[PDB]
Enzyme design. Structure first.
Site, short mmCIF file in Angstrom:
data_model
loop_
_atom_site.label_atom_id
_atom_site.label_comp_id
_atom_site.label_asym_id
_atom_site.label_seq_id
_atom_site.Cartn_x
_atom_site.Cartn_y
_atom_site.Cartn_z
CB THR A 186 -0.90 0.08 1.25
OG1 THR A 186 -0.10 -0.10 2.43
CG2 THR A 186 -2.01 -0.98 1.22
CG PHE A 225 -5.62 5.86 5.19
CD1 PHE A 225 -4.53 4.99 5.18
CD2 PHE A 225 -5.46 7.16 4.71
CE1 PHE A 225 -3.29 5.39 4.69
CE2 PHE A 225 -4.22 7.58 4.22
CZ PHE A 225 -3.14 6.69 4.20
CB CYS A 275 -5.35 2.65 7.66
SG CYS A 275 -3.59 2.31 7.65
#
Ligand code: HEM
EC number: 1.14.14.1
Length: 452
Positions: free
Chosen positions: A265, A390, A397
């Site tokens: 990512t 996110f 995240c």
């Protein structure tokens, strides 16, 4: 009143599956979304999900009182090696909540000060690599970004040096993890998993799990034996208490998790950013000017990275266009109706198609495909749940600040240290693993001869 849920072409008993006969399924689903609109049902043998693409539906899906993170089949296979670390745990697993509460303060923006020196360590290694290239040579962009992010997470996560910049073949850990990730993803499109043809795959998968666990268990054990305190997540995890700390195996799983969740990512984001930079020379020059104006010292300080505002905007714009973890799954907590139109049963799965969300014209305007960091000039102007690279809510995240601090540092340093050339007039080709990356992206980096 209740609407008929759009669904793409079905193929008898294969359902919608043949539509994903591609190594670019996310990009395929984007095309389906472009045809079918803000919501569609997607069926495979024994599977149903609904893909949401509009900010309107996704904000609603982002109601945590109504919908909670689902483990997609990808996450369920990743779980075989990520276990009950944060990423692959149900919210109602006590280890989710325990780990979450413990780690969050160590993933805060404030905590980024404590990791900065280590990120600088790996970032300087990247720069020096490129300083040391001969005049003819080029840089393999996602390849070096992944060396950097794996190393940075290894170093900040558990003070371990994979030394990817010292090698052709990665540390055995990384080979095992990448091969394990690849197998997890290969298993998504594997209709006949019990075919003896996969016995070697299964044997290898077990070998790779054992490699990962042994390395991380050794290091945890060495640290528990020494009592050495460092600036890594491992120190935080060993010291954390909910009364009880995380047990050593969950800590192992969190370390493996940070690597899986973060390496690609974050490396994809850097790669996509640099891609957009070289394809937009006026953006590159604005960013490069900021990097020079802000990064006045040989080593970037924590405080300086925070002043790279325009770099931050370039990174968000690259995240808007190509969110590198492009989808996340939710389930309906109860029977409910979505959008006033679409009834859902408790346990119904929803997938948020992030790149489509990010191309919602009713939110961003008609120019959604264009790379314009300036959209991010004033983040308060961005509507709630419009921008979700996110994830969402309490399952968002956890590494968001770490990733962004890393990416800003590194991008800043690259822009300060090099002029970049798209020598091949690179053609965007997005490889899909569990994440997205611009495959084959190569540039030439011409050093400005600025000492570190
Ligand atoms: C640009 C870089 C990154 C992107 C785009 C990204 C994206 C995401 C997304 C979308 C989720 C939610 C997935 C879902 O709902 O199933 C997630 C979760 C998570 N990520 Fe990130 N990530 C990035 C970097 C990182 C880094 C550097 C780390 C570790 C240091 C990390 C660690 C985690 C963890 C532990 C979770 C699970 C959170 C929880 O459920 O408690 N990520 N990430």
């Amino acid at each position: 009143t209740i609407k008929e849920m759009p669904q793409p072409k079905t193929f008898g008993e294969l359902k919608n599956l043949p539509l994903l006969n591609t190594d670019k399924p996310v990009q395929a689903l984007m095309k389906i979304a472009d045809e079918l609109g803000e919501i569609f049902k997607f069926e495979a043998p024994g599977r149903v999900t609904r893909y949401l693409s509009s900010q309107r539906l996704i904000k609603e899906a982002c109601d945590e009182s109504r919908f909670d993170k689902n483990l997609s089949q990808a996450l369920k296979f990743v779980r075989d090696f990520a276990g009950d670390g944060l990423f692959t745990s149900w919210t109602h697993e006590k280890n989710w909540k325990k780990a979450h509460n413990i780690l969050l303060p160590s993933f805060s923006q404030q905590a980024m000060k404590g990791y900065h020196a280590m990120m600088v360590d790996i970032a300087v290694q990247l720069v020096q690599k490129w300083e040391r290239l001969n005049a003819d040579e080029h840089i393999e962009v996602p390849e070096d970004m992944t060396r950097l992010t794996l190393d940075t997470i290894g170093l900040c996560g558990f003070n371990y040096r994979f030394n990817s910049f010292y090698r052709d073949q990665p540390h055995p850990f990384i080979t095992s993890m990448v091969r394990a990730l690849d197998e997890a993803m290969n298993k998504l499109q594997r209709a006949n998993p019990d075919d003896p043809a996969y016995d070697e795959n299964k044997r290898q998968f077990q070998e790779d799990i054992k490699v990962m666990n042994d390395l991380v268990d050794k290091i945890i054990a060495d640290r528990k034996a020494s009592g050495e305190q460092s600036d890594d997540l491992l120190t935080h995890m060993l010291n954390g208490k909910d009364g009880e700390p995380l047990d050593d195996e969950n800590i192992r799983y969190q370390i493996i998790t940070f690597l899986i969740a973060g390496h690609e990512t974050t490396s994809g984001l850097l790669s996509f950013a640099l891609y957009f930079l070289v394809k937009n020379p006026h953006v590159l020059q604005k960013a490069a000017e900021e990097a020079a104006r802000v990064l006045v010292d040989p080593v970037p300080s924590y405080k300086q990275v925070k002043q790279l505002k325009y770099v931050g905007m370039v990174l968000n714009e690259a995240l808007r266009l190509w969110p590198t973890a492009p989808a996340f799954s939710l389930y309906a907590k109860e029977d409910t109706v979505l959008g006033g139109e679409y009834p859902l049963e408790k346990g119904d799965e929803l997938m948020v198609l992030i790149p489509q969300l990010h191309r919602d014209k009713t939110i961003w305007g008609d120019d959604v495909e264009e790379f314009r960091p300036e959209r991010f000039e004033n983040p308060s102007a961005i509507p709630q749940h419009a921008f979700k690279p996110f994830g969402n809510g309490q399952r968002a995240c956890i590494g968001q600040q770490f990733a962004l601090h890393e990416a800003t540092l590194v991008l800043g340093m690259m822009l300060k240290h090099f002029d970049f050339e798209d020598h091949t007039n690179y053609e965007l080709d997005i490889k899909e693993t569990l994440t997205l990356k611009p495959e084959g992206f190569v540039v030439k980096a011409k050093s400005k001869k600025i000492p570190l």
